[PDB]
Design a protein around this ligand. Sequence first.
Ligand SMILES: [Cl-]
Ligand SMILES: [Cl-]
Length: 164
Amino acid sequence: MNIFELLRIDEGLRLKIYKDTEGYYTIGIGHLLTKSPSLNAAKSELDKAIGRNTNGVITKDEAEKLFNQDVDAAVRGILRNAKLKPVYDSLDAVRRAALINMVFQMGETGVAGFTNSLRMLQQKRWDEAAVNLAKSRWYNQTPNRAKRVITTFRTGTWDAYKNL
Ligand SMILES: [Cl-]
Ligand SMILES: [Cl-]
């Protein structure tokens, strides 16, 4: 499996503007448009992002393109973050995907705030990291997803996604 498949599973795919778990305007594969309560503002960011007058609807190819870009930015954020990079570099391939997932979901700044967990992941103390990671608003808000990510870090396999 790969990050693309993982996120596609975690985020779904919607071709019309929708509200995410937090009530923010989104489209595609978890492509956040705006934190603003205005559908108009969201439609405007949509058009700006696609380069066309979309009227809140996109095609599958446009969704995929935003997706690729978003994955790429996530990786890039990691590599550019002082707290994140050394962790990511220390992990194996499977676990790196888990880190990407969280950055895509919450942003580089948000993830870089899991200091304790990060340190544990760096030390390769899987069980401890998993417990520390579960003590978070993230886990309490999006438990099913968080559990999949956490299991991934714990086991170093894609098993949590293999039945999905
Ligand atoms: Cl964009
Ligand atoms: Cl969830």
